[PDB]
Amino acid sequence: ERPTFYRQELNKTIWEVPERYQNLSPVGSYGSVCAAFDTKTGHRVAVKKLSRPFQSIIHAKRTYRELRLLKHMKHENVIGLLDVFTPARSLEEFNDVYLVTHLMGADLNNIVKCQKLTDDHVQFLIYQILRGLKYIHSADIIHRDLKPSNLAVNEDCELKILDFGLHTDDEMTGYVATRWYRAPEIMLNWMHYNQTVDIWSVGCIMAELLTGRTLFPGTDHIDQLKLILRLVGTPGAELLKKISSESARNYIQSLAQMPKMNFANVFIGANPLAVDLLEKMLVLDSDKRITAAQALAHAYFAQYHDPDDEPVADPYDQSFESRDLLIDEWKSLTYDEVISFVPPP
Ligand SMILES: COc1ccc(N2C[C@@H](C(=O)N(C)OC)CC2=O)cc1
Ligand SMILES: [Cl-]
Ligand SMILES: [Cl-]
Ligand SMILES: [Cl-]
Ligand SMILES: [Cl-]
Ligand SMILES: [Cl-]
Ligand SMILES: [Mg+2]
């Protein structure tokens, strides 16, 4: 049974939504977002209306990708989907897609700049990031864009990962936080990357919680690489062999060699167990970084680790990513996922 919809103009946009959603108010603008009160669940929610979801094959496939990913994520430390709807009554009139999640308050940016964090706060915050990442990586999903603005935190220090990587050249240029948390092998297209890029990001975030300062605030790609290599050392021949670009290999060998620094003299006064974990995350060779599952068992988290309460995900079929389809075929696949949605308990 289809709910009754009502229409209203929010700023310059017509919004048509089920009656359950009340008191819509614009808060942000890929799509515009409104806060609302969900009278069925009692929650304050975010409602996102996608902008031109099927205007090109690239756009239509991205719409399908985002919906498939949000429908799969069912974990305490990851954003999940409360609802998805369209006012269309058939595939023939299908044009608009609306996504509904819990409304997030502050992000980790607010916290790190405004609050005095104890070591216990850092333990709990990083533990929750790693617990969510163990789940995400168990489905062979790579987040690719972990940074403080994509981590939501509440008054009780509880955390959720948001805004999966689903970014342009201009967005990554210059003195910008959009690049400061990226692993060097993806920042410079050294090689085919994998899920280890997310652990580099966690290391950069953890360092910033401990010091209150950005770890690698580069003014451009090359300045940032120089900051990275000064801390962790220039690469040895083993890693150089793995850099597929001969151009990038050539540039690396133009730099004078540098040893890895002493992290206890960089992170002055930090818990020695926190220093140890940072040395295992911030490794230049991605093959040798600690994994999320291994990091949860590190002694730094002894207060919180429970191997019977760190779940893995159901399998996630990503075969669509190598599939070539027409706009109307991606649109039909998206329609099927809208109408098959089953809400959480
Ligand atoms: C400041 O302006 C905004 C305020 C909130 C939000 N969002 C987006 C929500 C989400 O992850 N989905 C995909 O959107 C339904 C979660 C959330 O709180 C976005 C902008
Ligand atoms: Cl309703
Ligand atoms: Cl959620
Ligand atoms: Cl529609
Ligand atoms: Cl950020
Ligand atoms: Cl699947
Ligand atoms: Mg974001």
Side-chain angles (χ1 to χ4, degrees), residues 2-6 8-9 13-28 31-39 41-43 45-51 53-57 59-61 63-91 93-111 114 117-143 145-154 156-185 187-240 242-245 247-345:
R2 170 179 183 283
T4 296
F5 288 69
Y6 73 105
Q8 79 192 283
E9 179 168 345
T13 318
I14 291 292
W15 289 60
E16 186 162 4
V17 312
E19 294 181 301
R20 71 187 274 188
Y21 300 111
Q22 292 290 317
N23 305 328
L24 273 71
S25 175
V27 295
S32 325
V33 183
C34 279
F37 180 71
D38 177 16
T39 61
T41 65
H43 298 131
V45 296
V47 185
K48 181 167 76 161
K49 182 192 190 184
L50 293 186
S51 180
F54 307 111
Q55 66 174 131
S56 70
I57 295 166
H59 270 83
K61 186 179 179 179
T63 298
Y64 180 75
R65 175 186 299 118
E66 182 179 18
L67 183 53
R68 286 284 314 276
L69 278 170
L70 289 175
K71 285 183 70 176
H72 196 77
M73 297 289 96
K74 297 179 176 189
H75 187 278
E76 296 185 337
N77 303 118
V78 184
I79 191 74
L81 195 61
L82 281 175
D83 197 20
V84 56
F85 63 80
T86 177
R89 300 170 132 110
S90 69
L91 178 61
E93 60 182 53
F94 179 47
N95 284 297
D96 284 330
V97 175
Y98 297 77
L99 307 168
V100 184
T101 69
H102 281 289
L103 181 65
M104 303 292 101
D107 63 26
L108 195 54
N109 269 319
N110 307 142
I111 306 284
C114 293
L117 303 183
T118 73
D119 189 57
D120 289 323
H121 286 129
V122 180
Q123 289 177 33
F124 188 46
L125 286 165
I126 302 304
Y127 171 79
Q128 290 175 91
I129 299 172
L130 290 168
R131 190 171 176 255
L133 266 192
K134 182 201 180 183
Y135 174 90
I136 292 166
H137 288 175
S138 82
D140 285 342
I141 296 161
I142 305 174
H143 186 286
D145 194 28
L146 287 173
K147 60 189 177 176
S149 65
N150 284 343
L151 301 170
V153 185
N154 69 18
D156 303 344
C157 207
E158 305 174 320
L159 175 147
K160 275 188 206 303
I161 299 168
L162 310 154
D163 282 3
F164 285 72
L166 272 146
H167 284 278
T168 200
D169 284 342
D170 184 57
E171 279 160 358
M172 299 274 172
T173 301
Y175 189 70
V176 288
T178 55
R179 201 189 57 247
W180 294 338
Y181 306 87
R182 301 233 141 180
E185 70 266 18
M187 177 175 81
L188 295 165
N189 294 287
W190 279 355
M191 59 189 77
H192 287 309
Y193 67 82
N194 59 22
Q195 69 190 33
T196 60
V197 299
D198 290 334
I199 291 294
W200 182 274
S201 303
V202 176
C204 296
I205 292 160
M206 175 170 168
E208 182 168 343
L209 297 188
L210 290 166
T211 67
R213 303 292 161 198
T214 314
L215 180 55
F216 303 122
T219 59
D220 54 74
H221 290 62
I222 298 304
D223 183 64
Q224 191 172 324
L225 175 68
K226 290 176 176 171
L227 301 176
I228 289 167
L229 298 182
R230 186 184 179 244
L231 179 68
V232 305
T234 48
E238 194 177 329
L239 176 54
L240 283 169
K242 300 175 201 185
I243 295 165
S244 315
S245 35
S247 39
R249 268 198 328 267
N250 236 324
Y251 173 65
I252 286 158
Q253 304 183 270
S254 88
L255 306 173
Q257 295 188 66
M258 296 178 292
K260 170 192 166 302
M261 288 177 78
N262 180 323
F263 280 34
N265 291 328
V266 175
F267 303 99
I268 298 157
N271 189 330
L273 288 174
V275 176
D276 186 72
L277 183 61
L278 285 169
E279 292 186 316
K280 290 165 178 169
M281 299 175 161
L282 293 168
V283 181
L284 199 62
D285 188 341
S286 72
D287 287 347
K288 292 179 186 176
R289 289 173 202 153
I290 196 169
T291 69
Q294 293 151 13
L296 289 163
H298 190 275
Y300 188 54
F301 302 115
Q303 187 170 197
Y304 300 102
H305 177 46
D306 180 354
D308 291 326
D309 197 19
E310 290 161 359
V312 291
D314 285 338
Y316 179 67
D317 182 326
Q318 307 201 49
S319 55
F320 74 90
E321 288 288 6
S322 51
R323 198 173 299 147
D324 280 321
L325 300 173
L326 305 168
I327 284 187
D328 263 7
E329 293 171 323
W330 287 120
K331 182 161 148 168
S332 185
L333 285 179
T334 303
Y335 188 69
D336 293 338
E337 293 285 337
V338 174
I339 71 180
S340 65
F341 175 78
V342 173

